[PDB]
From a paper:
[name] mutations are among the most frequent gain-of-function alterations found in patients with cancer and their therapeutic targeting has long been a key objective in precision oncology. The [name] GTPase cycles between an active (GTP-bound) and an inactive (GDP-bound) state. Here we report the discovery and characterization of a non-covalent inhibitor that binds preferentially and with high affinity to the inactive state of [name] while sparing NRAS and HRAS. The pan-[name] inhibitor works by preferentially targeting the inactive state of [name] to prevent its reactivation by nucleotide exchange.
Extensive optimization led to BI-2865, a derivative with a prolinol substituent and a pyrimidine linker, which enabled a direct ionic interaction with E62, as well as a water-mediated hydrogen bond network with the side chain of R68 and the main chain carbonyl of Q61. We established high-resolution cocrystal structures (1.0–1.1 Å) of the pan-KRASi (BI-2865) in complex with several [name] variants. These showed a conserved binding pocket across variants defined by the α2 and α3 helices, the distal portion of the β1 sheet and the distal portion of the Switch II motif in [name]. A part of the KRASi pocket overlapped with that occupied by covalent G12C inhibitors, such as sotorasib and adagrasib, with the notable difference that the pan-KRASi engaged the pocket without relying on a covalent tether and did not extend in the P-loop channel near the G12 residue. By comparison, the affinity was 60–140 times lower for [name] variants loaded with the GTP analogue GCP. Selectivity for the inactive state is probably conferred by the conformation of the Switch II motif (including residues Q61 and E62), which partly occupies the drug pocket in the active state conformation of [name]. As a result, BI-2865 inhibited the proliferation of isogenic G12C, G12D or [name] mutant [name] expressing BaF3 cells more potently than precursor 1 with a mean IC50 of roughly 140 nM. Last, the inhibitor attenuated tumour growth in mice bearing [name] G12C, G12D, [name] and A146V mutant models, without causing apparent toxicity to the mice (at least as determined by monitoring animal weight).
Numbering used by the authors: 0 to 167
């Protein structure tokens, strides 16, 4: 049967979680997507010759630590932690997202990729070395992406699927 992988995209508002998701789903860059819409989207993709079913939860909205929201995020098997390379605050937020993922998954070993989005822009404020070094601290991959040009998009999502397989 076809394996389904539940992937969750997290990070500060405005980093491009929806744009990255919709590039994967629609193969189109969408510069405008209601910042409050949290939803999940499925797509069949071939990864290393295996057709699998991706179910991608594009997170949005208010930070809340109810049992319900914890259980919703707990369904994720792997997480993309996204910051924007021209937004230092979004990078400084990453450790909080990672903390919460470890908490709800009750594991120090959750499949996870650090994603530096908006790589097409010239306004870089987060050095690549600093982001690579944070991924090294966590023992996870770092992928540079642009939802606008498609740079890194498959690499980010497909790496997460490969991590989920290894973890199994
Ligand atoms: C960085 C923060 O800001 C925001 C703003 C919006 N969201 C968050 C946020 N943190 O984790 C999460 C997720 C969705 C991540 C996956 C696992 C779980 S489990 C659960 N219950 C979640 C929730 N809500 C989450 N989201 N944080 C700063 C710092 C603290 C105060 N705050 C102003
Ligand atoms: N140049 C550029 N803009 C992007 C990129 N990804 C998202 N954006 C823009 O960043 C803003 C927020 O994107 P959105 O997908 O709504 O972010 P979300 O709140 O994380 O879902 C919008 O103005 C998008 O057009 C990218 O890779 N490059
Ligand atoms: Mg969004």
């Amino acid at each position: 049967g076809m394996t389904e992988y539940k992937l969750v995209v997290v990070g500060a508002v405005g980093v491009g979680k929806s744009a990255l998701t919709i590039q994967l789903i629609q193969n189109h860059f969408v510069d405008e997507y209601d910042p409050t819409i949290e939803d999940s989207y499925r797509k069949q993709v071939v990864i290393d010759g295996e057709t699998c079913l991706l179910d991608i939860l594009d997170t949005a909205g208010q930070e809340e630590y109810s049992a319900m929201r914890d259980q919703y995020m707990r369904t994720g098997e792997g997480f993309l932690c996204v910051f924007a390379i021209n937004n230092t605050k979004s990078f400084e937020d990453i450790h909080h997202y990672r903390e919460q993922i470890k908490r709800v998954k009750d594991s120090e070993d959750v499949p996870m990729v650090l994603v530096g989005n908006k790589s097409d822009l010239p306004s870089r404020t987060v050095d690549t070395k600093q982001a690579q070094d944070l991924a090294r601290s966590y023992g996870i991959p770092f992928i540079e992406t642009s939802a606008k040009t498609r740079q890194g998009v498959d690499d980010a999502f497909y790496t997460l699927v490969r991590e989920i397989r290894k973890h199994k």
